Amino acid sequence: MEGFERELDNIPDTLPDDERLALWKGKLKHYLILSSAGKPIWSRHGDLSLVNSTMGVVQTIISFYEGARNPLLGFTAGKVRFVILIKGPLYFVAISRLRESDAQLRAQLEALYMQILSTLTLPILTNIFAHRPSTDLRGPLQGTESLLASLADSFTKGSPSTLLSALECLRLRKSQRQAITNIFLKSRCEELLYGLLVAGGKLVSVIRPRKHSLHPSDLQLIFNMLFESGGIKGNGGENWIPLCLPAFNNTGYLYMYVSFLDDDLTALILISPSREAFYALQSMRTRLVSQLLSTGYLSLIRSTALSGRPSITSILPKTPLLHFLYKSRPNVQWCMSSLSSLTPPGATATETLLARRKLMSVYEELHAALHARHAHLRVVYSTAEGLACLGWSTPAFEVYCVAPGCVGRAGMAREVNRVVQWARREEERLFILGGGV
Amino acid sequence: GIIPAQLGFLAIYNPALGTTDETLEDQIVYYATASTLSQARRRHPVSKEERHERLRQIGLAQGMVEFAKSFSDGEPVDTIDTEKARVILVEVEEGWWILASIDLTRLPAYEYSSREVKPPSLLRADLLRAYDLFLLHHGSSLSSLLASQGRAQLVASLTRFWDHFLATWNVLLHGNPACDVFGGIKLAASGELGIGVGEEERGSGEREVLEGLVERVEGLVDVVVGRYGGPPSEEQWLGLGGEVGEEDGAVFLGVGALDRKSLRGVVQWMEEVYVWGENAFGKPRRDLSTGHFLLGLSNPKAIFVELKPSYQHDHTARLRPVIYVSQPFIYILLFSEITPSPSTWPTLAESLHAQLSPLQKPLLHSTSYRPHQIFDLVYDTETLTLQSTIPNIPDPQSIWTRVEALQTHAQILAILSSGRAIPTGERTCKTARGWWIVWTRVVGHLRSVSSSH
Amino acid sequence: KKVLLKVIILGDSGVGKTSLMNQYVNKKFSASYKATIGADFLTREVMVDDRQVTMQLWDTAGQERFQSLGVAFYRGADCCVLVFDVNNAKSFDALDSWRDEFLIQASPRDPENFPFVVLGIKRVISTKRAQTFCQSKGGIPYFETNVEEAFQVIARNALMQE
């Protein structure tokens, strides 16, 4: 709220040098991925000319700490926080003026590392940086830079999925979701390993075999690379992306087939351990798609995705809450109320973006309060007219809520219990309890 | 085989002292490490490799400061989180920095955990309190100390004071972290004496007696009296190297004539004297004639204070301290630098004792006054007074078990850090152990209710 | 599109202390952390062959306290520059030790023709002694200081290696 409107606006290259440097320093958040050699691998804001000396400084500081056998995990400078992650040859540093915790910035840097490792498998990365530490990774990362930039933009905008390390799901009936999963099973192929149906970035259905299990890290990686980044639209149509899925197998290449269900943007993802399966997976999709319109489930999916997150009044009749964010510790999945209630009905992109950023920053402050290291906090209430907020971290779930300041803890606890009760009532209709057969 | 958390190293440096090469070692006006600190710890040789490590650490801190000058728009690096240590960089004043890396607990390869280590806010508060005490015992400000006494004398004084302080410093959580993080003046449980007529139970006549002592006694500028411990029962109460209790604290502050910052410094020195009697800085050895007087007016030991502008007496004073000690009470009396002669000290001491001994019983009666289980902590930012009820951490019968004490105090420090309340909105945070912390900002008091199950 | 070279320029204890690098780099993109961190940080682009190349200059401090962390700054250095002063006698005499320190500390893959362009910043060290060290190992392109003209040769030697 201190210049966030132009924070996502990139630094123009036509400006002279010192104005560009001042603009770069004025950015609220910076993501800097580099090698152990200090070479600029990727920067969210500004080209490598702008960030080159700064990245060298960061690398030599971390290398100072590595030489002292005491790895550096980050440091604070007033309101600014620098978080440093060392994933082998790769050094990730996040500079935040938005007051996030070390854990949240570390999770965001871990997500960036996850995307990079998905681009090229871990043994290949380690070998290319070991047998040649003087390696510029920007070569193989030619197509990955746009995805990383968009993912970092989503992080700055406020990513609840990354904050909670979970995923969102369509509010589908349990019978309807079971029918969709059974339709998914009725068209299955031996080469198919991980089936996935998503609608508007929200999980719809998951298909996994008995032996191999779909780790939540893999799902987070897929959603970050496709829906959080929004790069799935790029090269629209059939999309045969080689993949890594390091949680499943980081030493090998899977292959994910992405298709648009336009026959809001419903997507079908099919991950197979063989490169030649694509055509067969194509025959899979036409088999699945034809089943969906015939049974009408595709139209239902599109209609459910078209309506966004349910409004706070509809979820809780006559509630003082403006928004909430409920995460279930099992099933690793979350849900939230519509963001349209925060902003006035007639608003521009900048106003809605500012409202989302404010609410998300409140949520990350609450999340940091709950998950402070060596602090067994269970409930946290704050008053940032004002704006009251509560966060509850029962070992079975995790709920954050925001209301106008004229509510108080007494009523806010009642509202939090109410929304938790609603989520428990609709647990089967909100979360993927189990995968496919 | 668990290695406890200890101060990995500490250093005080002025970057403006070392400009060119072969003057970088002049930057480190003080340096200490655990191996160096061992001798001082027992009481209270450097080589090229160690000097290289010291210069590397100081240059690394300066490099972080300069690198973050651009991003933070003037704010320097204050906290550094590393795998094996927690580093605190505090700018004590303009151009003077103290960098302290505290080694985390090693658990048998090693696993490095900071479960019991003080948070960065509390470590910075302790370092600032030590720096304020050093200023209290030496000059007005470190820059003035240097420009007056030369870098060699500054190095000697810093070495002595900081070796003594770091010998007894506990990087782990201990005592009352909630009171320690705020700094300020820790008032006793009774608070202050009665201001005017009608509060004689709290010590209104007692406060009048103290004020008349200030005015009547020649050369007396200020008086602060604090209660530490209990009434007389071989006691050896003034030592024990223990911790200041929750009830212990300043009872009657100055009559004015002292800035609240320097008044806080004097009160902290009183606490240090109570904890480290005969071992505190200045060596407050009890008088041979009578044990009531220690650090008499008769080595002209004088502490340096800044007087309040609303006083006749540009504001530095260099007053002379005299500590009159009773079993429960400690009176620190700040006399003028020259007006009371040391020659008349034997005569002045008898009058002082005759004017404070009859005060002992009424003072004991008045300080005994007190204003599910609820603990609060009111810290008035304007007047720096701190009145708290949160119990201190028991040493390894209080109403607390030690584990609960550490958990509660670490939690409280977490709310203070999150609430941006430490000097250097309502935050209501609960837990699964039945503790309900409620931090409120009174409009400038900062209350911290600590409701228990 | 974009090619990157992390230049490591080895000042022989203050010889290369921004005496000549000041007017080379755009001073806007700088970080004078050589006194504390142990390396001045610079960045400059050159026109090598019909396409630009960025070099991140690391003007190493060379102090003994930073030597133990030598592999820290020397990681992945595609370029090295042995810089001395023509007037100073010990400037040229320390080149062999500096080169051995680089060769052992970072261990370049093929140091036989590793980029080792020498900048003779402007005498005890004559031109004969100036290229004697060059012809000793590989005839490295020494240039007496127009400084940019001694760095596109660095790119021509480095891109062909990549």
Numbering used by the authors:
A (entry chain A): 195 to 457, 486 to 606, 612 to 664
B (entry chain B): 11 to 54, 92 to 155, 182 to 306, 312 to 376, 389 to 403, 426 to 483, 500 to 524, 544 to 571, ...
C (entry chain C): 5 to 126, 134 to 156, 163 to 178, 182
Which text from the study accompanies this structure?
The tri-longin domain (TLD) RabGEF complexes represent a family of RabGEFs with a unique conserved structural core. In each complex, two subunits that contain three longin domains (LD1 to LD3) each form a heterodimer, which is required for catalytic activity toward the cognate Rab GTPases. We here report the cryo-EM structures of the Mon1-Ccz1 and Inturned-Fuzzy core complexes bound to their cognate GTPases Ypt7 and Rab23 in the nucleotide exchange transition states, revealing a conserved catalytic mechanism with distinct modes of substrate recognition. Thus, TLD RabGEFs rely on both conservation and variability in the switch 1 regions of their substrates to realize catalytic efficiency and specificity.
To provide the molecular basis of these observations, we determined the cryo-EM structures of fungal Mon1-Ccz1 from Chaetomium thermophilum (Ct) bound to nucleotide-free Ypt7 and of human Fuzzy-Inturned in complex with nucleotide-free Rab23. To support the formation of a stable transition state of the complex, the nucleotide-free variant CtYpt7N125I was coexpressed with CtMon1 and CtCcz1ΔL in Escherichia coli. Analysis of purified complexes by cryo-EM revealed a mixture of dimeric CtMon1-Ccz1 and trimeric CtMon1-Ccz1-Ypt7 particles. In the trimeric complex, the structures of Mon1 and Ccz1 remain virtually unchanged (RMSD, 0.67 Å), and we assigned the additional density to the G domain of Ypt7. We did not observe structural changes in binding of Ypt7 to intact Mon1-Ccz1 in comparison to the Mon1LD1-Ccz1LD1 subcomplex (RMSD of 1.03 Å over 436 residues). The experimental map does not reveal unmodeled density that could be interpreted as the Mon1NTD or Ypt7HVD. Consequently, our structures do not provide support for models that suggest an autoinhibitory interaction of the NTD of Mon1 with the longin domains or recognition of the Ypt7HVD by Mon1-Ccz1 at the chosen conditions. Remodeling of the Ypt7 switch 1 region by Mon1-Ccz1 causes an opening of the nucleotide binding pocket, removal of a guanine base interacting phenylalanine (F33), and the insertion of a catalytic lysine residue (K38) in the binding site that expels the magnesium cofactor. F33 and a tyrosine (Y37) adjacent to the catalytic lysine bind to hydrophobic pockets on Mon1-Ccz1, thus stabilizing the switch 1 conformation. Collectively, this structural arrangement was shown to lower the nucleotide affinity of Ypt7 and thus promote nucleotide exchange.
